[PDB]
């Protein structure tokens, strides 16, 4: 079980999938037709795991990308390195999600559902050495919160032997383009606190923040924190991708990183966080990575960890680093930040380190967390839950779309669930 | 008595066995190809040894007699593309496509047992192609429950299988301070009493106690698992100098037996090597044999993270390398006698047993080492045991009393039922083992 | 007895014989003007099997074109293979049959019947190792269903013990111009059921699909059809000629493909099937091929696996195979397709291996199979007649021609008869 398909979707999670795949190609080394040029067993170990091999030496990556408006996937198949996608990865309908929970899943879902669960079946018997799917998608696009909440649920009730994993993004609470898009977002988080095992938050403020501070720039660009997304699910898969002195599979990462079936949640930072120039200012070194990784502005969860209560934390870095070193770091740092870090554990600490090293980078980590804070980052959003529906406005849309108060009462309840186990546990 | 079986479990004990295989290589001077390597000697090989760990062959290839055995595919790929598998036979190799579980779960599962027959009837033909056996060697890290409980699982079947040798079994401790994995102490726990009801003597070595020496006495600013592994390669060479080279004093493996086990239910025993040192202090420093049987003593070379001078004496053996005078160790022996540096027992206290080799110690390239004609290797019975034994157990109890994971165990393979057994026996041996110590 | 002839008649099964030697001349590599090209010795053998050894080395293929049209023979030796033709090998006469079973079977058939009969004499007495009589005609026209069947009669008659392939397309349930034309199918296959031994299930509605989701054609053409049958149909003859680990006859698929003498139906179904393109993007492999052979969408018969159950099953393959392949394909497809695999035999599988690659290919394969979906055609056909002849509608044509609404119920109860031997059987 070596083998991991990402699963595409969203009308935002697509370029996610798209500049996963090209990070992919750019750091393993791969023509966008497909021919290898990696080096040189390993990468193609990893080839196999992520593509298939065509004829003719070529390789086609291993994606399923599923979402409306089909003129956004030609554009991009239009693109120099998407010229090795299979036809067969993408398998798209029409038109549009309209921005709305019922339309993306209750609606259209309900008649792709049964060819996109073709599509994953026959790549299922195409490669039997899967193991898990890795899920890119909008938590407030219409698209994303649409059908990606169905899609999950369908394959946690065909597939529980198969491992979770998504990448989802969540809705910003201060700016909005519309208010449906939290209330997407929670009636979608209803369900996928159920039917997931594993989710990275990730919130685009702090993506704006992060590129106001390192990369500078006034008005943030998608692609870049595409490409920084990207980087950070290939410092999370290296532990496959590349042997180093302790691999470990995602069941060993997630049994060691939830005490309970609860706590998909995970709050991600990526480091070094390089700024344009700063390249020659500092030196790569483990105590400024460290700070970095505890910096609570730094994660793209993002939540506060000062406010909030380590319950699980995990450092996966890659270079050359030494084992002592490391050691003495984290035992300094769990020491110092005893008030944040629980102490019945009383190590809480799972570190995996990376033989090789990133192209560009001496050194690179990627840090996982879990934090009681992050019950804020939803209440808000369940605050707007009570504070956009109470005025009752365009209650008649749902109301045309079938969706009634008690799923809404449900999400408010698993929402209810989720602060408790936040407080169980309490902060 | 001729022939001892060496097993390799878990990703530590496979990286520790190829260490083993390339340092006894390199003190024969075998390389690769070998056909012995070459035949000049005498006593590289023929005659033993080689005769005890590397099979003899028709065409005379000295073939080393591993079981590699891994559920991690990658691990196996990595030990297939070095020249140890040339040496080894592919048959005698063991694959397996997905892990265990993290760590104990699968390991000691029945899943783990599936692959115990093949196993079995692979160690019945390699035992049948060569000729007599003195015991089996075992080498699984204590805190990888995968190798945990697959080698508790061979060393049951061997010992209802055969049962006529000593099965020796070499087990890696993590450091009692930081642990990477959370079910390390329970798996660790759950594979004592598995040890305790089929191994018939033990090995205890610290990795903590491995990375301070080389930092310490190697003076090496970056520890490496490749270090540790050169160590114990090191260590388990110094076990069996005797028995691959002749010397003036040649020692048995049941003498090691009867040694370590003076009791009904004793079979612990700490491993120390001195002198350890930097290549460079050592060409500089020129100690005496006296100040070597001192170091042993002290609580780095002792290789655990435990001081001996709380631990009480039991009976004791040191092998030496190279060139060794027997008058000089004896009045070594007396002068610690008479420093009373470890308490001693009223059964025992006499028990100071000396053995000489005439192999010289050879330091690898890779991991620095004191470059001395004569080594020390002191296999010693002290109660800093009990003490490790019930610092991991506070922390098992610790964890135990909320758990945070007992029902992937309990749904997999286990239940709370043997976690609580497991714990009870821990508990009594130590109860045991501090009563042994404390009625002198 | 390798030698085996040709038959072509119909308004269709015309072009469908030619695109057969279309085939047959670029499988081993031929010139349509009877210049030997293939290499070395077999090629030799399937033209005295198929052709004739001429003057000067020429070679002509044994073919029997009749139809009531001359413009069709023109239209066929417009064509560059089988422009030349002994006037022998073909025999035309006038006008039309009305798309009439009864009349072109009753007038527009016996007028020429004894002229083709003489013909086909002739030529098996100039054929020693005559076999196998391949039959292209179509079902749906009443002037072919006529015709052939007659044809297919008097060769019956003449020939009991030379097998008879046919290979002619059933009507297409959404064509509603003429409601005689499934009367006429039902009458001829009421007939040829005794008349024809060996027949293979065709529909037009199934080559539409067919091309509009493999080679996604706007408008459906008869040419690309008439090349995929005529692939079909030449590859179960070169599984026999050219050399194999297996090849296969037809007294082989009549002893074996075959329980009971009263079952003559055989379903069809080709792979590879790649889309227009996606040629590189494909890598041909045994489980592919596989799950295309099990689906009904690849199927042309076309039988639903799903809802027939399967009462034998064959697959035949050219190309380098292995026979450990596609023992562990049909090992796995019974364990998991064992509710349609019937429980009498229990294990139905018969298997056939061209080595030499096929034409333009490194590996094609053929399928048929013998389901419980056939009689759902026959209640169609049979609920088609019934309402549409209770109208009494264009009957006085019929009673023009004489045939009697007794023998009508005589082969509506027969071909029930067929339906509940289908049911025995039961699905």
């Known amino acids: 079980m070596r083998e991991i398909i990402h699963i595409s979707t969203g009308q935002c999670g697509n370029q996610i999938g798209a500049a996963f795949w090209e990070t992919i190609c750019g750091e393993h080394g791969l023509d966008f037709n497909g021919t290898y040029h990696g080096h040189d067993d390993i990468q193609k170990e990893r080839l196999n795991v992520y593509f298939n091999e065509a004829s003719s030496g070529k390789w086609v990556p291993r994606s399923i990308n599923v979402d409306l408006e089909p003129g956004t996937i030609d554009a991009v198949r239009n693109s120099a390195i998407g010229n090795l996608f299979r036809p067969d990865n993408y398998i798209f309908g029409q038109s549009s999600a309209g921005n709305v929970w019922a339309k993306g899943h209750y609606t259209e879902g309900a008649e792709l559902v049964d060819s996109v669960m073709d599509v994953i079946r026959r790549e299922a018997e195409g490669c039997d050495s899967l193991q898990g799917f890795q899920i890119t998608h909008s938590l407030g696009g219409g698209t994303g919160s649409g059908m990606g909440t169905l899609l999950i649920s369908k394959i946690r009730e065909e597939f529980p032997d198969r491992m979770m994993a998504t990448f989802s993004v969540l809705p910003s609470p201060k700016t909005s383009d519309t208010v449906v898009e939290p209330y997407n977002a929670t009636l979608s988080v209803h369900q996928l606190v159920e039917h997931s095992d594993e989710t990275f938050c990730i919130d685009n403020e702090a993506l704006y923040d992060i590129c106001q501070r390192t990369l500078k720039l006034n008005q943030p660009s998608y692609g870049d924190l595409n490409n920084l997304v990207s980087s950070v699910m290939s410092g999370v898969t290296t532990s496959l991708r590349y042997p180093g002195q302790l691999n470990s599979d995602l069941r060993k990462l997630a049994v060691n990183l939830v005490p309970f079936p609860r706590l998909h949640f995970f709050m991600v930072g990526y480091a070094p966080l390089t700024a344009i120039g700063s390249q020659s200012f500092r030196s790569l070194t483990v105590p400024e990575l460290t700070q970095q990784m505890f910096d609570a502005k730094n994660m793209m969860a993002a939540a506060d960890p000062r406010n909030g209560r380590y319950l699980t934390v995990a450092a996966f870095f890659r270079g050359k680093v030494s084992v002592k070193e490391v050691e003495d770091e984290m035992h300094k740092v769990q020491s110092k930040n005893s008030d944040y870090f629980v102490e019945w554990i009383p190590n809480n600490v799972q570190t995996a380190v990376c033989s090789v090293a990133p192209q560009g980078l001496d050194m690179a980590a990627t840090f996982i967390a879990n934090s009681t804070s992050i019950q804020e980052l939803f209440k808000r959003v369940g605050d707007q839950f009570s504070a956009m529906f109470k005025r009752k406005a365009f209650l008649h849309w749902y109301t045309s779309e079938g969706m009634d108060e008690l799923e809404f009462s449900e999400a408010e309840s698993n929402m209810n669930d989720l602060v408790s186990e936040y407080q169980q546990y309490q902060e | ?440």
Chains 1, 3 share one sequence.
């Open chain 2, 1 to 440: 008595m001729r022939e001892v079986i060496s097993i390799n479990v878990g990703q530590a004990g496979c990286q520790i066995g190829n260490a083993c295989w390339e340092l006894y290589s390199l003190e024969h001077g075998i390389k690769p190809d070998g056909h012995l390597e070459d035949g000049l000697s005498k006593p590289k090989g023929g005659e033993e040894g080689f005769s005890t760990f590397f099979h003899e062959t028709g065409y005379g290839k000295f073939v080393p007699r591993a079981i590699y055995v891994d559920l991690e595919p990658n691990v196996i790929d990595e030990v297939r593309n070095g020249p140890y598998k040339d040496l080894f036979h592919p048959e005698q190799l063991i694959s397996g496509k997905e892990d265990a579980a993290n760590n104990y779960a699968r390991g000691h599962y029945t899943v783990g047992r599936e692959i115990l027959g093949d196993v079995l009837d692979r160690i019945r033909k390699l035992a049948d192609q060569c000729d007599g056996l003195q015991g089996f060697l075992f080498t699984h890290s204590l805190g990888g429950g995968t190798g945990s409980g697959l080698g508790s699982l061979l060393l049951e079947e061997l010992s209802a299988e055969y049962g006529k040798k000593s099965k020796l079994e070499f087990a890696v401790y993590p450091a009692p301070q930081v642990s990477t994995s959370v079910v390390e102490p329970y798996n660790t726990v759950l594979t004592t009493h598995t040890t305790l009801e089929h191994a018939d003597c033990t090995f205890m070595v610290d990795n903590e106690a491995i990375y301070d020496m080389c930092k310490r006495n190697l003076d090496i600013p970056r520890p490496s698992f490749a270090n540790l592994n050169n160590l114990i390669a090191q260590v388990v060479s110094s076990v069996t100098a005797s028995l691959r080279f002749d010397g003036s004093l040649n020692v048995d493996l049941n003498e090691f037996q009867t040694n370590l086990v003076p009791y009904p239910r004793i079979h612990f025993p700490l491993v120390s090597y001195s002198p350890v040192l930097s290549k460079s202090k050592a060409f500089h420093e020129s100690n005496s044999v006296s100040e070597i049987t001192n170091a042993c003593f002290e609580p780095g070379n002792q290789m655990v993270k435990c001081d001996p001078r709380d631990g009480k004496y039991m009976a004791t053996c040191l092998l030496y390398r190279g060139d060794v005078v027997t008058r000089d160790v004896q009045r070594a022996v007396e002068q610690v006698k008479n420093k009373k540096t470890v308490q001693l027992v009223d059964w025992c206290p006499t028990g100071f047993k000396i053995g000489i080799c005439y192999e010289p110690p050879t330091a690898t390239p890779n991991s620095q080492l004191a470059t001395v004609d004569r080594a020390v290797c002191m296999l010693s019975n002290t109660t800093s045991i009990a003490e490790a034994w019930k610092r991991i157990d506070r922390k098992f109890d610790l964890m135990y009393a909320k758990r945070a994971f007992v029902h992937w165990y309990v749904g997999e393979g286990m239940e709370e039922g043997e976690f609580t057994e497991a714990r009870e026996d821990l508990a009594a041996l130590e109860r045991d083992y501090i009563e042994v110590g404390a009625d002198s």
